[PDB]
C-alpha cells in the first residue's frame, strides 16, 4: 500500500541522520523499492579492502514482509551462496515489522566479521571455516582481490568519499555567506601564526569587508560570479555591454562545437541571474538566488564552459603554457569543463579575457613582509572586482 512507500522514507531518514561509514545504502534513482548498498570489507577480516555491492528489493507491502537482499558481488562466506543470497534469518523466519534496514545491513556487516559456520548456506565453506582456517582466509582474500577489489567498483566508493566530504563541508560553509567585516579572519587563525595575522592586518589596510565561498573546488568561479554580478548592480552601460557578450557567448560556443540543447540549460540560469541584476534587486535577493544549490551550480557550470570556450579559441596563445604534455582541449576536458576540479592562473586569465573584464586578486601566503600582493588582470585595467587568494581557496573582498 501507500503506507509502504510512506515507511521507506522514514527508514531512509533514519539511515540519513547517522551515516554508517562501512555499511550504507540508498534508492536507485526514481525507484524507492529498489535500493543498492555498498559494503566495505571490515578490517581484520580476509574481506578487508574489497567493496561488496548488494541489491535490495522491498515488498509491495512493507514492513509486514522482509526485504529481499542479495550480494551482486561474488564472495566467499559459509552463509552467502555463490548465487548471491544471504543465510541471515532475520530476512526469513525471524523478521519483525519493528526492524529498520539499518538493523539488517549492520547485521550483515556483523556477519562478515564473524561468520556463522553452524547454519551454512554452503556446507563446504563452513567445513573449511571450522577446520582449516588459513585456506579459508587466503581463498576469501583472492575472492576479494579479483571480484571485489577489481577496478571500477572502487570508483563508486571513492565517489562516496567525495560526497561524504563536501556535504559536511557544506554543513559548515554555505555557498555564498553574508557580507562580514574581515576582522573575523583574525579569529580563524592561530596565535603561533603571527605572520598570517600580519598579512591580515595588512588586509584590513585595503579592504573593509569579506564574503566567503564554500570550498567545493568551484571556489573561484562561485566568487567571480557573485562579485561581478553585484558589481553590475551599479554601472548600467557595463551591465548592458555585459549582457550582450553573454547572449553572443551561447552560439559562440555552439559554433565552437558544443552541443546546444545541453548548454542552453546553463545559459538560461546565467541570463536569469543577469535578469535580476538588470532589473535591480537588492544585493541580498541576489545572494538568496546564489545560495540556491541548482541556480548557483548551473552558473558555475557555464563559467567553466566559457573558460573552456575561450581556451579552445586561443589555443596557440596557451598550448605551450600548459603544464605537462596535454593539448588545450585535453586540458579543458581534464582540468576545466568538469565540476569541482581546481582552478588555476590560466583559468582566471581565460575567463577574464573571455568576458572582457578586469579582476583584482589579493595573494597572501607566507611572504616575509606584511605584503599581500595585488594582481590586476589583465594588467592596468582598473578593477571594480576584488578577490582574496588564501592557498587552495578563493573568497571576495570589499573596499
Amino acid at each position: 500500500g501507500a503506507m509502504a512507500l510512506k515507511r521507506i522514507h522514514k527508514e531512509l531518514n533514519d539511515l540519513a541522520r547517522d551515516p554508517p561509514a562501512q555499511c550504507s545504502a540508498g534508492p536507485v534513482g526514481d525507484d524507492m523499492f529498489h535500493w543498492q548498498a555498498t559494503i566495505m570489507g571490515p578490517n581484520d577480516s580476509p574481506y578487508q579492502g574489497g567493496v561488496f555491492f548488494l541489491t535490495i528489493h522491498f515488498p509491495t507491502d512493507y514492513p509486514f514482509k522482509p526485504p529481499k537482499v542479495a550480494f551482486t558481488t561474488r564472495i566467499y562466506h559459509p552463509n552467502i551462496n555463490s548465487n548471491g543470497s544471504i543465510s541471515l534469518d532475520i530476512l526469513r523466519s525471524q523478521w519483525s515489522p519493528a526492524l529498520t534496514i539499518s538493523k539488517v545491513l549492520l547485521s550483515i556487516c556483523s556477519l562478515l566479521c564473524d561468520p556463522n559456520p553452524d547454519d551454512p548456506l554452503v556446507p563446504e565453506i563452513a567445513r573449511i571455516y571450522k577446520t582449516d582456517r588459513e585456506k579459508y582466509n587466503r581463498i576469501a582474500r583472492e575472492w576479494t582481490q579479483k571480484y571485489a577489489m577489481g577496478g571500477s567498483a572502487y570508483d563508486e566508493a571513492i565517489m562516496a568519499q567525495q560526497d561524504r566530504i563536501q556535504q559536511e563541508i557544506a554543513v559548515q560553509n554555505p555557498l555564498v555567506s553574508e557580507r562580514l567585516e574581515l576582522s573575523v579572519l583574525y579569529k580563524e587563525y592561530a596565535e603561533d601564526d603571527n605572520i598570517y595575522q600580519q598579512k591580515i592586518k595588512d588586509l584590513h589596510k585595503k579592504y573593509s569587508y569579506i564574503r566567503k565561498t564554500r570550498p567545493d573546488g568551484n571556489s573561484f568561479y562561485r566568487a567571480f560570479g557573485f562579485s561581478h554580478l553585484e558589481a553590475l548592480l551599479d554601472d548600467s552601460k557595463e551591465l548592458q555591454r555585459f549582457k550582450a557578450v553573454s547572449a553572443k557567448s551561447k552560439e559562440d560556443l555552439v559554433s565552437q562545437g558544443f552541443t546546444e540543447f545541453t548548454i542552453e540549460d546553463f545559459h538560461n540560469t546565467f541570463m536569469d541571474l543577469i535578469e535580476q541584476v538588470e532589473k535591480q534587486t537588492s544585493v541580498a535577493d541576489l545572494l538568496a538566488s546564489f545560495n540556491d544549490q541548482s541556480t548557483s551550480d548551473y552558473l558555475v557550470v557555464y563559467l567553466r564552459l566559457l573558460t573552456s570556450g575561450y581556451l579552445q579559441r586561443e589555443s596557440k596563445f596557451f598550448e605551450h603554457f600548459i603544464e605537462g604534455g596535454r593539448t588545450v582541449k585535453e586540458f579543458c576536458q581534464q582540468e576545466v569543463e568538469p565540476m569541482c576540479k581546481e582552478s588555476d592562473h590560466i583559468h582566471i586569465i581565460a575567463l577574464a579575457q573571455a568576458l572582457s573584464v578586469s579582476i583584482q586578486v589579493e595573494y597572501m601566503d607566507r611572504g616575509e613582509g606584511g605584503t599581500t600582493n595585488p594582481h590586476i588582470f589583465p594588467e592596468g585595467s582598473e578593477p571594480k572586482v576584488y578577490l582574496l587568494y588564501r592557498p587552495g581557496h578563493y573568497d571576495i573582498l570589499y573596499k
Binding site: 561509514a21 562501512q22 566495505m40 578490517n43 578487508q48 579492502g49 572502487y154 570508483d155 566508493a157 571513492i158 568519499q161 567525495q162 566530504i165 563536501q166 563541508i169 560553509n173 580563524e188 587563525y189 592561530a190 601564526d193 598570517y196 564554500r214 570550498p215 567545493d216 573546488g217 581546481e342 601566503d365 607566507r366 588564501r390 592557498p391 587552495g392 581557496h393
Partner: protein, 76 residues
C-alpha cells in the same frame, strides 16, 4: 605536530609531522605505513585540495586537524 588523516575505509591514521613539513613529505610518511604510493595519493583539508610542494603552515592545518586521503587509483 600531530595530525589525523581519515581514509576511504573509514579508518583513521595518525601522523607525526612538523607544521613546516611538505605535503610531499606527508604523503611520503603515509606511504611509509600503508604503502600507498604518493603518486596514487591525494589529500584534502577542509574542502581544500592539497599541493605536493606546499607546507602545512601554508594551508593553516594546525596540530590536531583532520584531513582526508582520497586515492586516485590510476583510472580505466
Amino acid at each position: 605536530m600531530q595530525i589525523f588523516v581519515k581514509t576511504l575505509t573509514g579508518k583513521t591514521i595518525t601522523l607525526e609531522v612538523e607544521p613546516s613539513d611538505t605535503i610531499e613529505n606527508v604523503k611520503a610518511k603515509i606511504q611509509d605505513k600503508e604503502g600507498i604510493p604518493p603518486d596514487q595519493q591525494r589529500l584534502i583539508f577542509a574542502g581544500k585540495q592539497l599541493e605536493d610542494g606546499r607546507t602545512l603552515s601554508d594551508y593553516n592545518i594546525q596540530k590536531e586537524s583532520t584531513l582526508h586521503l582520497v586515492l586516485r587509483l590510476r583510472g580505466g
